[PDB]
mmCIF file of all heavy atoms in Angstrom:
data_model
loop_
_atom_site.group_PDB
_atom_site.id
_atom_site.type_symbol
_atom_site.label_atom_id
_atom_site.label_comp_id
_atom_site.label_asym_id
_atom_site.label_seq_id
_atom_site.Cartn_x
_atom_site.Cartn_y
_atom_site.Cartn_z
ATOM 1 N N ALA A 1 -48.329 -21.056 -75.787
ATOM 2 C CA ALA A 1 -46.995 -21.501 -75.389
ATOM 3 C C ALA A 1 -46.319 -20.465 -74.491
ATOM 4 O O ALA A 1 -45.629 -20.816 -73.533
ATOM 5 C CB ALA A 1 -46.137 -21.776 -76.616
ATOM 6 N N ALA A 2 -46.521 -19.190 -74.807
ATOM 7 C CA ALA A 2 -45.942 -18.107 -74.024
ATOM 8 C C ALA A 2 -46.540 -18.066 -72.621
ATOM 9 O O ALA A 2 -45.828 -17.875 -71.637
ATOM 10 C CB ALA A 2 -46.159 -16.780 -74.727
ATOM 11 N N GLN A 3 -47.852 -18.258 -72.535
ATOM 12 C CA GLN A 3 -48.540 -18.303 -71.248
ATOM 13 C C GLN A 3 -48.032 -19.449 -70.370
ATOM 14 O O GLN A 3 -48.038 -19.347 -69.143
ATOM 15 C CB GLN A 3 -50.049 -18.440 -71.460
ATOM 16 C CG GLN A 3 -50.703 -17.206 -72.054
ATOM 17 C CD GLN A 3 -52.117 -17.473 -72.532
ATOM 18 O OE1 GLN A 3 -52.666 -18.550 -72.307
ATOM 19 N NE2 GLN A 3 -52.710 -16.493 -73.202
ATOM 20 N N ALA A 4 -47.621 -20.543 -71.002
ATOM 21 C CA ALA A 4 -47.165 -21.729 -70.281
ATOM 22 C C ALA A 4 -45.717 -21.622 -69.798
ATOM 23 O O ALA A 4 -45.225 -22.519 -69.112
ATOM 24 C CB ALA A 4 -47.329 -22.963 -71.159
ATOM 25 N N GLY A 5 -45.038 -20.534 -70.151
ATOM 26 C CA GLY A 5 -43.704 -20.267 -69.635
ATOM 27 C C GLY A 5 -42.534 -20.590 -70.553
ATOM 28 O O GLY A 5 -41.399 -20.705 -70.089
ATOM 29 N N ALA A 6 -42.796 -20.734 -71.850
ATOM 30 C CA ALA A 6 -41.736 -21.010 -72.819
ATOM 31 C C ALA A 6 -40.694 -19.895 -72.811
ATOM 32 O O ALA A 6 -41.029 -18.729 -72.610
ATOM 33 C CB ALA A 6 -42.320 -21.179 -74.209
ATOM 34 N N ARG A 7 -39.432 -20.252 -73.030
ATOM 35 C CA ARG A 7 -38.360 -19.263 -73.042
ATOM 36 C C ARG A 7 -38.366 -18.530 -74.377
ATOM 37 O O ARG A 7 -38.164 -17.319 -74.435
ATOM 38 C CB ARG A 7 -37.005 -19.932 -72.791
ATOM 39 C CG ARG A 7 -35.804 -18.994 -72.870
ATOM 40 C CD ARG A 7 -34.493 -19.765 -72.881
ATOM 41 N NE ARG A 7 -34.207 -20.298 -71.552
ATOM 42 C CZ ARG A 7 -33.212 -21.132 -71.265
ATOM 43 N NH1 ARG A 7 -32.366 -21.527 -72.210
ATOM 44 N NH2 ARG A 7 -33.053 -21.557 -70.019
ATOM 45 N N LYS A 8 -38.608 -19.277 -75.448
ATOM 46 C CA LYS A 8 -38.617 -18.716 -76.791
ATOM 47 C C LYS A 8 -39.461 -19.591 -77.709
ATOM 48 O O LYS A 8 -39.352 -20.817 -77.690
ATOM 49 C CB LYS A 8 -37.198 -18.580 -77.347
ATOM 50 C CG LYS A 8 -37.141 -17.843 -78.680
ATOM 51 C CD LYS A 8 -35.757 -17.275 -78.960
ATOM 52 C CE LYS A 8 -35.520 -15.970 -78.219
ATOM 53 N NZ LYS A 8 -34.301 -15.271 -78.716
ATOM 54 N N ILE A 9 -40.304 -18.948 -78.508
ATOM 55 C CA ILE A 9 -41.180 -19.653 -79.429
ATOM 56 C C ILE A 9 -40.914 -19.145 -80.833
ATOM 57 O O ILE A 9 -41.085 -17.964 -81.114
ATOM 58 C CB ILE A 9 -42.668 -19.466 -79.059
ATOM 59 C CG1 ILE A 9 -42.937 -19.916 -77.620
ATOM 60 C CG2 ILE A 9 -43.562 -20.244 -80.017
ATOM 61 C CD1 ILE A 9 -43.816 -18.959 -76.845
ATOM 62 N N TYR A 10 -40.496 -20.044 -81.715
ATOM 63 C CA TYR A 10 -40.341 -19.705 -83.120
ATOM 64 C C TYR A 10 -41.633 -20.060 -83.841
ATOM 65 O O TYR A 10 -42.016 -21.227 -83.920
ATOM 66 C CB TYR A 10 -39.142 -20.431 -83.729
ATOM 67 C CG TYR A 10 -37.831 -20.037 -83.085
ATOM 68 C CD1 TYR A 10 -37.217 -20.860 -82.150
ATOM 69 C CD2 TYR A 10 -37.214 -18.833 -83.404
ATOM 70 C CE1 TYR A 10 -36.022 -20.498 -81.555
ATOM 71 C CE2 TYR A 10 -36.022 -18.462 -82.815
ATOM 72 C CZ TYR A 10 -35.430 -19.298 -81.892
ATOM 73 O OH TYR A 10 -34.242 -18.932 -81.305
ATOM 74 N N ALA A 11 -42.306 -19.036 -84.354
ATOM 75 C CA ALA A 11 -43.619 -19.204 -84.958
ATOM 76 C C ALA A 11 -43.545 -19.067 -86.475
ATOM 77 O O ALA A 11 -43.428 -17.961 -87.003
ATOM 78 C CB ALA A 11 -44.591 -18.189 -84.375
ATOM 79 N N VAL A 12 -43.632 -20.198 -87.167
ATOM 80 C CA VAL A 12 -43.466 -20.232 -88.616
ATOM 81 C C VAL A 12 -44.822 -20.172 -89.320
ATOM 82 O O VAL A 12 -45.737 -20.931 -88.996
ATOM 83 C CB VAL A 12 -42.685 -21.491 -89.040
ATOM 84 C CG1 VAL A 12 -42.521 -21.548 -90.557
ATOM 85 C CG2 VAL A 12 -41.327 -21.528 -88.350
ATOM 86 N N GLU A 13 -44.929 -19.280 -90.301
ATOM 87 C CA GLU A 13 -46.161 -19.099 -91.066
ATOM 88 C C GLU A 13 -45.833 -18.642 -92.484
ATOM 89 O O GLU A 13 -45.092 -17.676 -92.678
ATOM 90 C CB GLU A 13 -47.083 -18.087 -90.376
ATOM 91 C CG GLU A 13 -48.330 -17.702 -91.172
ATOM 92 C CD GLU A 13 -49.230 -18.888 -91.490
ATOM 93 O OE1 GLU A 13 -49.485 -19.711 -90.585
ATOM 94 O OE2 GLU A 13 -49.690 -18.992 -92.648
ATOM 95 N N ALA A 14 -46.386 -19.343 -93.469
ATOM 96 C CA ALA A 14 -46.058 -19.100 -94.870
ATOM 97 C C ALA A 14 -46.999 -18.097 -95.537
ATOM 98 O O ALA A 14 -46.631 -17.454 -96.519
ATOM 99 C CB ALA A 14 -46.073 -20.408 -95.638
ATOM 100 N N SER A 15 -48.212 -17.961 -95.008
ATOM 101 C CA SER A 15 -49.180 -17.031 -95.581
ATOM 102 C C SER A 15 -48.916 -15.617 -95.078
ATOM 103 O O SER A 15 -48.084 -15.405 -94.197
ATOM 104 C CB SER A 15 -50.614 -17.458 -95.242
ATOM 105 O OG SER A 15 -50.978 -17.061 -93.932
ATOM 106 N N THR A 16 -49.636 -14.652 -95.639
ATOM 107 C CA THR A 16 -49.478 -13.258 -95.242
ATOM 108 C C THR A 16 -50.006 -13.013 -93.830
ATOM 109 O O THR A 16 -49.785 -11.950 -93.248
ATOM 110 C CB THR A 16 -50.192 -12.319 -96.227
ATOM 111 O OG1 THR A 16 -51.558 -12.723 -96.376
ATOM 112 C CG2 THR A 16 -49.511 -12.363 -97.584
ATOM 113 N N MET A 17 -50.690 -14.003 -93.265
ATOM 114 C CA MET A 17 -51.168 -13.888 -91.893
ATOM 115 C C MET A 17 -49.982 -13.611 -90.976
ATOM 116 O O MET A 17 -50.117 -12.961 -89.936
ATOM 117 C CB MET A 17 -51.897 -15.161 -91.461
ATOM 118 C CG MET A 17 -52.628 -15.045 -90.131
ATOM 119 S SD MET A 17 -53.798 -13.670 -90.078
ATOM 120 C CE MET A 17 -54.711 -13.918 -91.604
ATOM 121 N N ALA A 18 -48.812 -14.084 -91.394
ATOM 122 C CA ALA A 18 -47.570 -13.851 -90.668
ATOM 123 C C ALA A 18 -47.382 -12.374 -90.360
ATOM 124 O O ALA A 18 -46.844 -12.027 -89.309
ATOM 125 C CB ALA A 18 -46.386 -14.376 -91.458
ATOM 126 N N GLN A 19 -47.825 -11.501 -91.261
ATOM 127 C CA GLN A 19 -47.661 -10.072 -91.026
ATOM 128 C C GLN A 19 -48.578 -9.636 -89.884
ATOM 129 O O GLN A 19 -48.245 -8.724 -89.126
ATOM 130 C CB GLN A 19 -47.965 -9.238 -92.279
ATOM 131 C CG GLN A 19 -46.916 -9.312 -93.387
ATOM 132 C CD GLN A 19 -47.275 -10.293 -94.492
ATOM 133 O OE1 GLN A 19 -48.438 -10.638 -94.671
ATOM 134 N NE2 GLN A 19 -46.275 -10.727 -95.250
ATOM 135 N N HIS A 20 -49.728 -10.294 -89.759
ATOM 136 C CA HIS A 20 -50.692 -9.952 -88.716
ATOM 137 C C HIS A 20 -50.287 -10.515 -87.356
ATOM 138 O O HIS A 20 -50.529 -9.894 -86.320
ATOM 139 C CB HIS A 20 -52.092 -10.454 -89.078
ATOM 140 C CG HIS A 20 -52.688 -9.785 -90.276
ATOM 141 N ND1 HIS A 20 -52.724 -8.415 -90.424
ATOM 142 C CD2 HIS A 20 -53.291 -10.298 -91.376
ATOM 143 C CE1 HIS A 20 -53.312 -8.114 -91.568
ATOM 144 N NE2 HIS A 20 -53.665 -9.237 -92.164
ATOM 145 N N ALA A 21 -49.701 -11.708 -87.363
ATOM 146 C CA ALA A 21 -49.273 -12.356 -86.128
ATOM 147 C C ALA A 21 -48.256 -11.496 -85.381
ATOM 148 O O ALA A 21 -48.336 -11.349 -84.162
ATOM 149 C CB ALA A 21 -48.693 -13.726 -86.426
ATOM 150 N N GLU A 22 -47.306 -10.927 -86.115
ATOM 151 C CA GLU A 22 -46.292 -10.071 -85.511
ATOM 152 C C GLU A 22 -46.934 -8.868 -84.828
ATOM 153 O O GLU A 22 -46.497 -8.449 -83.757
ATOM 154 C CB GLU A 22 -45.279 -9.607 -86.558
ATOM 155 C CG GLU A 22 -44.145 -8.752 -85.996
ATOM 156 C CD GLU A 22 -43.375 -9.437 -84.878
ATOM 157 O OE1 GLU A 22 -43.406 -10.684 -84.800
ATOM 158 O OE2 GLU A 22 -42.735 -8.720 -84.075
ATOM 159 N N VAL A 23 -47.975 -8.318 -85.447
ATOM 160 C CA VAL A 23 -48.691 -7.186 -84.871
ATOM 161 C C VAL A 23 -49.243 -7.579 -83.503
ATOM 162 O O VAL A 23 -49.177 -6.799 -82.553
ATOM 163 C CB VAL A 23 -49.818 -6.697 -85.809
ATOM 164 C CG1 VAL A 23 -50.770 -5.753 -85.081
ATOM 165 C CG2 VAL A 23 -49.233 -6.018 -87.030
ATOM 166 N N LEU A 24 -49.795 -8.784 -83.406
ATOM 167 C CA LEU A 24 -50.352 -9.260 -82.146
ATOM 168 C C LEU A 24 -49.248 -9.515 -81.122
ATOM 169 O O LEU A 24 -49.444 -9.294 -79.927
ATOM 170 C CB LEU A 24 -51.177 -10.534 -82.359
ATOM 171 C CG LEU A 24 -52.505 -10.390 -83.112
ATOM 172 C CD1 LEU A 24 -53.231 -11.726 -83.164
ATOM 173 C CD2 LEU A 24 -53.400 -9.328 -82.486
ATOM 174 N N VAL A 25 -48.096 -9.990 -81.587
ATOM 175 C CA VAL A 25 -46.972 -10.246 -80.696
ATOM 176 C C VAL A 25 -46.525 -8.937 -80.049
ATOM 177 O O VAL A 25 -46.266 -8.889 -78.847
ATOM 178 C CB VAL A 25 -45.802 -10.923 -81.449
ATOM 179 C CG1 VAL A 25 -44.537 -10.959 -80.592
ATOM 180 C CG2 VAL A 25 -46.187 -12.328 -81.879
ATOM 181 N N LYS A 26 -46.435 -7.876 -80.845
ATOM 182 C CA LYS A 26 -46.027 -6.573 -80.323
ATOM 183 C C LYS A 26 -47.076 -5.949 -79.409
ATOM 184 O O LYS A 26 -46.737 -5.405 -78.357
ATOM 185 C CB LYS A 26 -45.676 -5.605 -81.456
ATOM 186 C CG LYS A 26 -44.331 -5.890 -82.091
ATOM 187 C CD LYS A 26 -43.951 -4.832 -83.110
ATOM 188 C CE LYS A 26 -42.486 -4.965 -83.520
ATOM 189 N NZ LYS A 26 -42.204 -6.187 -84.328
ATOM 190 N N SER A 27 -48.342 -6.012 -79.808
ATOM 191 C CA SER A 27 -49.395 -5.368 -79.036
ATOM 192 C C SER A 27 -49.618 -6.104 -77.717
ATOM 193 O O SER A 27 -50.194 -5.548 -76.782
ATOM 194 C CB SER A 27 -50.696 -5.310 -79.838
ATOM 195 O OG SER A 27 -51.139 -6.611 -80.185
ATOM 196 N N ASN A 28 -49.158 -7.351 -77.645
ATOM 197 C CA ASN A 28 -49.232 -8.118 -76.405
ATOM 198 C C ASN A 28 -47.901 -8.146 -75.645
ATOM 199 O O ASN A 28 -47.764 -8.875 -74.663
ATOM 200 C CB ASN A 28 -49.681 -9.553 -76.702
ATOM 201 C CG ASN A 28 -51.176 -9.658 -76.947
ATOM 202 O OD1 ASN A 28 -51.951 -9.900 -76.020
ATOM 203 N ND2 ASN A 28 -51.587 -9.479 -78.197
ATOM 204 N N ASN A 29 -46.934 -7.345 -76.087
ATOM 205 C CA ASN A 29 -45.652 -7.226 -75.394
ATOM 206 C C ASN A 29 -44.972 -8.579 -75.161
ATOM 207 O O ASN A 29 -44.512 -8.863 -74.057
ATOM 208 C CB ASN A 29 -45.834 -6.510 -74.052
ATOM 209 C CG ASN A 29 -46.407 -5.114 -74.207
ATOM 210 O OD1 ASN A 29 -45.911 -4.312 -74.998
ATOM 211 N ND2 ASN A 29 -47.447 -4.812 -73.441
ATOM 212 N N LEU A 30 -44.918 -9.410 -76.198
ATOM 213 C CA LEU A 30 -44.298 -10.729 -76.086
ATOM 214 C C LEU A 30 -43.185 -10.918 -77.118
ATOM 215 O O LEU A 30 -42.844 -12.046 -77.473
ATOM 216 C CB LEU A 30 -45.355 -11.827 -76.246
ATOM 217 C CG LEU A 30 -46.280 -12.060 -75.046
ATOM 218 C CD1 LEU A 30 -47.450 -12.943 -75.439
ATOM 219 C CD2 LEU A 30 -45.519 -12.686 -73.887
ATOM 220 N N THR A 31 -42.612 -9.814 -77.587
ATOM 221 C CA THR A 31 -41.565 -9.873 -78.605
ATOM 222 C C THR A 31 -40.311 -10.575 -78.093
ATOM 223 O O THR A 31 -39.517 -11.091 -78.881
ATOM 224 C CB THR A 31 -41.165 -8.473 -79.099
ATOM 225 O OG1 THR A 31 -42.325 -7.638 -79.183
ATOM 226 C CG2 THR A 31 -40.510 -8.571 -80.471
ATOM 227 N N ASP A 32 -40.129 -10.588 -76.775
ATOM 228 C CA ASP A 32 -38.964 -11.230 -76.175
ATOM 229 C C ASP A 32 -39.110 -12.748 -76.126
ATOM 230 O O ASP A 32 -38.160 -13.456 -75.787
ATOM 231 C CB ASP A 32 -38.720 -10.697 -74.758
ATOM 232 C CG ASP A 32 -39.916 -10.887 -73.841
ATOM 233 O OD1 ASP A 32 -41.067 -10.742 -74.310
ATOM 234 O OD2 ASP A 32 -39.705 -11.190 -72.647
ATOM 235 N N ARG A 33 -40.298 -13.249 -76.458
ATOM 236 C CA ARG A 33 -40.587 -14.667 -76.292
ATOM 237 C C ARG A 33 -41.145 -15.303 -77.570
ATOM 238 O O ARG A 33 -40.892 -16.480 -77.838
ATOM 239 C CB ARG A 33 -41.549 -14.857 -75.120
ATOM 240 C CG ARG A 33 -40.973 -14.319 -73.816
ATOM 241 C CD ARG A 33 -41.882 -14.554 -72.634
ATOM 242 N NE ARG A 33 -42.101 -15.977 -72.408
ATOM 243 C CZ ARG A 33 -43.090 -16.478 -71.676
ATOM 244 N NH1 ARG A 33 -43.966 -15.673 -71.087
ATOM 245 N NH2 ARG A 33 -43.201 -17.790 -71.533
ATOM 246 N N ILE A 34 -41.888 -14.531 -78.362
ATOM 247 C CA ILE A 34 -42.431 -15.044 -79.619
ATOM 248 C C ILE A 34 -41.720 -14.382 -80.795
ATOM 249 O O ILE A 34 -41.717 -13.158 -80.930
ATOM 250 C CB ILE A 34 -43.955 -14.823 -79.713
ATOM 251 C CG1 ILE A 34 -44.663 -15.488 -78.529
ATOM 252 C CG2 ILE A 34 -44.493 -15.379 -81.031
ATOM 253 C CD1 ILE A 34 -46.152 -15.198 -78.452
ATOM 254 N N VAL A 35 -41.139 -15.212 -81.655
ATOM 255 C CA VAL A 35 -40.445 -14.743 -82.847
ATOM 256 C C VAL A 35 -41.128 -15.317 -84.080
ATOM 257 O O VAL A 35 -41.048 -16.516 -84.340
ATOM 258 C CB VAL A 35 -38.957 -15.142 -82.822
ATOM 259 C CG1 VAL A 35 -38.241 -14.598 -84.049
ATOM 260 C CG2 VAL A 35 -38.288 -14.640 -81.557
ATOM 261 N N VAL A 36 -41.781 -14.454 -84.849
ATOM 262 C CA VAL A 36 -42.442 -14.882 -86.070
ATOM 263 C C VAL A 36 -41.404 -15.027 -87.176
ATOM 264 O O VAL A 36 -40.617 -14.115 -87.425
ATOM 265 C CB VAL A 36 -43.558 -13.899 -86.479
ATOM 266 C CG1 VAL A 36 -44.198 -14.321 -87.799
ATOM 267 C CG2 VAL A 36 -44.607 -13.802 -85.381
ATOM 268 N N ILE A 37 -41.410 -16.184 -87.830
ATOM 269 C CA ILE A 37 -40.503 -16.454 -88.936
ATOM 270 C C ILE A 37 -41.344 -16.669 -90.189
ATOM 271 O O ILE A 37 -41.938 -17.734 -90.360
ATOM 272 C CB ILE A 37 -39.609 -17.675 -88.649
ATOM 273 C CG1 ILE A 37 -38.800 -17.444 -87.368
ATOM 274 C CG2 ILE A 37 -38.687 -17.949 -89.832
ATOM 275 C CD1 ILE A 37 -37.985 -18.638 -86.919
ATOM 276 N N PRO A 38 -41.399 -15.660 -91.076
ATOM 277 C CA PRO A 38 -42.196 -15.825 -92.297
ATOM 278 C C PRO A 38 -41.593 -16.823 -93.276
ATOM 279 O O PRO A 38 -40.398 -16.763 -93.566
ATOM 280 C CB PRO A 38 -42.209 -14.417 -92.902
ATOM 281 C CG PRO A 38 -41.866 -13.503 -91.770
ATOM 282 C CD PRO A 38 -40.915 -14.278 -90.924
ATOM 283 N N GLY A 39 -42.427 -17.724 -93.785
ATOM 284 C CA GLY A 39 -41.990 -18.710 -94.755
ATOM 285 C C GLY A 39 -42.517 -20.105 -94.479
ATOM 286 O O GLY A 39 -43.188 -20.349 -93.475
ATOM 287 N N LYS A 40 -42.207 -21.028 -95.381
ATOM 288 C CA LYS A 40 -42.622 -22.414 -95.233
ATOM 289 C C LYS A 40 -41.651 -23.129 -94.300
ATOM 290 O O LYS A 40 -40.443 -22.900 -94.357
ATOM 291 C CB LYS A 40 -42.686 -23.102 -96.598
ATOM 292 C CG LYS A 40 -43.622 -22.405 -97.575
ATOM 293 C CD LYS A 40 -43.578 -23.019 -98.962
ATOM 294 C CE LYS A 40 -44.485 -22.255 -99.918
ATOM 295 N NZ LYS A 40 -44.278 -22.635 -101.342
ATOM 296 N N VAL A 41 -42.181 -23.987 -93.435
ATOM 297 C CA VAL A 41 -41.365 -24.655 -92.431
ATOM 298 C C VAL A 41 -40.316 -25.532 -93.099
ATOM 299 O O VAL A 41 -39.285 -25.850 -92.503
ATOM 300 C CB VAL A 41 -42.241 -25.482 -91.469
ATOM 301 C CG1 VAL A 41 -42.789 -26.732 -92.163
ATOM 302 C CG2 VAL A 41 -41.447 -25.860 -90.228
ATOM 303 N N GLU A 42 -40.582 -25.919 -94.341
ATOM 304 C CA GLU A 42 -39.647 -26.723 -95.113
ATOM 305 C C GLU A 42 -38.458 -25.904 -95.617
ATOM 306 O O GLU A 42 -37.477 -26.468 -96.098
ATOM 307 C CB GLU A 42 -40.366 -27.364 -96.306
ATOM 308 C CG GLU A 42 -41.451 -28.371 -95.938
ATOM 309 C CD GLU A 42 -42.804 -27.725 -95.680
ATOM 310 O OE1 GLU A 42 -42.868 -26.481 -95.583
ATOM 311 O OE2 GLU A 42 -43.806 -28.465 -95.587
#
């Protein structure tokens, strides 16, 4: 989604993988566009 030009992406994940996703967001310098939100989408 970030590659396609999205202004902001809210990325919801309930498992602990959420902790890993944020690491990838930072190491790819996309913190201004991808926001990981830990928890269930509900």
Side-chain angles (χ1 to χ4, degrees):
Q3 291 167 7
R7 176 191 286 173
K8 187 159 280 192
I9 304 136
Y10 297 102
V12 179
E13 173 60 45
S15 80
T16 54
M17 190 55 49
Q19 287 98 21
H20 294 310
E22 182 56 22
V23 166
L24 290 183
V25 170
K26 284 186 168 69
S27 60
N28 282 268
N29 301 310
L30 285 168
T31 322
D32 57 323
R33 301 183 61 197
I34 303 174
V35 182
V36 177
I37 302 174
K40 303 175 182 168
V41 72
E42 295 86 349

